[PDB]
Amino acid sequence: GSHMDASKIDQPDLAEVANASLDKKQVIGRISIPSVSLELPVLKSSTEKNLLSGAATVKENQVMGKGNYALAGHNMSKKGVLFSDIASLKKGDKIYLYDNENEYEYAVTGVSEVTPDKWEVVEDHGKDEITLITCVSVKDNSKRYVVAGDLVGTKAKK
Protein backbone atom coordinates (compact mmCIF):
# COMPACT_ATOMS: atom_id res chain seq x y z
CA GLY A 1 0.00 0.00 0.00
CA SER A 2 1.91 3.01 1.32
CA HIS A 3 5.26 1.23 0.99
CA MET A 4 6.09 -0.98 -1.98
CA ASP A 5 8.41 -3.96 -1.57
CA ALA A 6 11.75 -3.93 -3.40
CA SER A 7 11.20 -7.54 -4.46
CA LYS A 8 10.20 -6.29 -7.92
CA ILE A 9 13.79 -6.12 -9.20
CA ASP A 10 14.36 -7.01 -12.84
CA GLN A 11 16.45 -10.14 -13.31
CA PRO A 12 19.59 -9.36 -15.43
CA ASP A 13 20.01 -10.94 -18.87
CA LEU A 14 20.77 -14.62 -19.37
CA ALA A 15 24.41 -13.74 -20.01
CA GLU A 16 25.02 -13.05 -16.35
CA VAL A 17 23.18 -16.27 -15.58
CA ALA A 18 25.55 -18.55 -17.49
CA ASN A 19 28.57 -16.31 -16.87
CA ALA A 20 27.92 -15.77 -13.15
CA SER A 21 30.38 -17.37 -10.75
CA LEU A 22 28.09 -20.24 -9.72
CA ASP A 23 28.44 -21.08 -6.03
CA LYS A 24 27.97 -24.85 -6.15
CA LYS A 25 29.49 -25.30 -2.72
CA GLN A 26 26.64 -23.15 -1.42
CA VAL A 27 23.95 -25.47 -2.79
CA ILE A 28 22.08 -27.24 0.00
CA GLY A 29 19.48 -29.06 -2.13
CA ARG A 30 17.85 -29.53 -5.55
CA ILE A 31 14.34 -29.36 -7.01
CA SER A 32 12.90 -31.51 -9.80
CA ILE A 33 9.64 -31.43 -11.75
CA PRO A 34 9.44 -34.06 -14.57
CA SER A 35 5.95 -32.83 -15.45
CA VAL A 36 7.44 -29.60 -16.81
CA SER A 37 10.96 -31.00 -17.22
CA LEU A 38 12.35 -28.40 -14.82
CA GLU A 39 15.44 -28.89 -12.64
CA LEU A 40 17.46 -26.35 -10.64
CA PRO A 41 19.81 -26.31 -7.58
CA VAL A 42 18.57 -24.70 -4.35
CA LEU A 43 20.66 -21.74 -3.23
CA LYS A 44 20.69 -20.92 0.48
CA SER A 45 21.50 -17.25 -0.10
CA SER A 46 18.52 -15.06 -1.06
CA THR A 47 20.75 -12.62 -2.93
CA GLU A 48 20.17 -11.22 -6.42
CA LYS A 49 22.99 -13.37 -7.79
CA ASN A 50 21.56 -16.52 -6.17
CA LEU A 51 18.13 -15.81 -7.64
CA LEU A 52 19.69 -16.20 -11.10
CA SER A 53 19.97 -19.95 -10.51
CA GLY A 54 16.16 -20.09 -10.58
CA ALA A 55 15.79 -21.09 -6.94
CA ALA A 56 16.77 -19.37 -3.71
CA THR A 57 15.60 -19.78 -0.12
CA VAL A 58 13.19 -17.09 1.00
CA LYS A 59 13.51 -17.50 4.75
CA GLU A 60 16.69 -18.39 6.61
CA ASN A 61 14.84 -20.48 9.20
CA GLN A 62 13.35 -22.77 6.53
CA VAL A 63 13.70 -26.52 7.05
CA MET A 64 13.38 -28.84 4.05
CA GLY A 65 10.93 -31.64 4.85
CA LYS A 66 9.30 -29.71 7.71
CA GLY A 67 7.11 -26.59 7.89
CA ASN A 68 6.31 -24.25 4.99
CA TYR A 69 9.30 -24.23 2.67
CA ALA A 70 9.57 -21.48 0.05
CA LEU A 71 11.80 -20.56 -2.88
CA ALA A 72 11.86 -17.59 -5.26
CA GLY A 73 12.77 -17.86 -8.95
CA HIS A 74 13.21 -15.22 -11.66
CA ASN A 75 10.84 -15.46 -14.62
CA MET A 76 11.07 -13.16 -17.64
CA SER A 77 8.05 -14.87 -19.24
CA LYS A 78 10.31 -16.13 -22.03
CA LYS A 79 10.37 -19.86 -22.74
CA GLY A 80 13.73 -21.18 -21.57
CA VAL A 81 13.88 -18.84 -18.60
CA LEU A 82 13.60 -19.83 -14.94
CA PHE A 83 10.18 -20.42 -13.38
CA SER A 84 8.48 -19.79 -16.76
CA ASP A 85 7.07 -23.33 -17.02
CA ILE A 86 6.23 -23.39 -13.33
CA ALA A 87 2.90 -21.71 -14.09
CA SER A 88 2.15 -24.78 -16.23
CA LEU A 89 1.91 -26.85 -13.05
CA LYS A 90 -1.42 -28.65 -12.56
CA LYS A 91 -3.29 -29.66 -9.40
CA GLY A 92 -1.93 -32.86 -7.87
CA ASP A 93 1.28 -32.49 -9.89
CA LYS A 94 4.17 -34.34 -8.27
CA ILE A 95 7.26 -32.38 -7.25
CA TYR A 96 10.44 -33.78 -5.69
CA LEU A 97 12.87 -32.07 -3.34
CA TYR A 98 16.35 -33.48 -2.82
CA ASP A 99 18.19 -32.63 0.37
CA ASN A 100 21.82 -33.59 0.78
CA GLU A 101 20.57 -36.53 2.85
CA ASN A 102 17.08 -37.32 1.53
CA GLU A 103 14.24 -36.68 -0.89
CA TYR A 104 10.74 -35.38 -0.10
CA GLU A 105 7.65 -35.93 -2.26
CA TYR A 106 5.36 -32.90 -2.73
CA ALA A 107 2.06 -32.62 -4.62
CA VAL A 108 0.94 -29.37 -6.26
CA THR A 109 -2.49 -28.30 -5.06
CA GLY A 110 -2.99 -25.33 -7.38
CA VAL A 111 -2.15 -21.66 -7.90
CA SER A 112 -3.47 -18.35 -6.54
CA GLU A 113 -3.19 -14.59 -7.07
CA VAL A 114 -1.23 -12.75 -4.38
CA THR A 115 0.90 -9.61 -4.06
CA PRO A 116 4.76 -9.58 -3.88
CA ASP A 117 4.48 -8.07 -0.40
CA LYS A 118 2.56 -11.10 0.89
CA TRP A 119 5.16 -12.62 3.24
CA GLU A 120 2.31 -14.50 4.92
CA VAL A 121 2.36 -17.23 2.24
CA VAL A 122 5.95 -17.96 3.31
CA GLU A 123 5.12 -17.92 7.05
CA ASP A 124 5.01 -21.26 8.93
CA HIS A 125 1.47 -22.65 9.23
CA GLY A 126 2.30 -25.63 11.47
CA LYS A 127 2.19 -27.91 8.42
CA ASP A 128 4.48 -29.30 5.72
CA GLU A 129 4.05 -27.16 2.59
CA ILE A 130 6.00 -25.66 -0.30
CA THR A 131 5.60 -22.21 -1.86
CA LEU A 132 7.13 -21.07 -5.15
CA ILE A 133 7.17 -17.43 -6.19
CA THR A 134 6.78 -16.80 -9.92
CA CYS A 135 6.19 -13.45 -11.60
CA VAL A 136 3.43 -13.27 -14.22
CA SER A 137 5.50 -11.19 -16.63
CA VAL A 138 8.11 -8.44 -16.90
CA LYS A 139 5.34 -6.18 -18.22
CA ASP A 140 2.75 -7.07 -15.57
CA ASN A 141 3.61 -5.41 -12.26
CA SER A 142 0.02 -5.35 -10.99
CA LYS A 143 -0.13 -8.78 -9.33
CA ARG A 144 1.80 -12.05 -9.24
CA TYR A 145 0.61 -15.62 -8.65
CA VAL A 146 2.11 -18.06 -6.17
CA VAL A 147 2.12 -21.83 -6.57
CA ALA A 148 1.45 -23.94 -3.49
CA GLY A 149 2.09 -27.63 -2.85
CA ASP A 150 1.58 -29.95 0.12
CA LEU A 151 3.80 -32.77 1.40
CA VAL A 152 2.41 -36.20 0.50
CA GLY A 153 5.29 -38.46 1.57
CA THR A 154 9.03 -38.84 2.22
CA LYS A 155 11.61 -41.24 0.79
CA ALA A 156 15.34 -41.39 1.62
CA LYS A 157 17.88 -41.71 -1.21
CA LYS A 158 19.31 -45.25 -1.08
Binding site: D5, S7, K8, I9, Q11, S46, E48, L51, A56, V58, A72, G73, H74, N75, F83, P116, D117, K118, W119, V121, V122, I133, T134, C135, R144
Partner: peptide
Protein backbone atom coordinates in the same frame (compact mmCIF):
# COMPACT_ATOMS: atom_id res chain seq x y z
CA UNK B 1 8.46 -12.08 0.21
CA UNK B 2 11.79 -11.50 -1.62
CA UNK B 3 12.48 -10.89 -5.33
CA UNK B 4 10.52 -12.55 -8.15
Amino acid sequence: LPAT
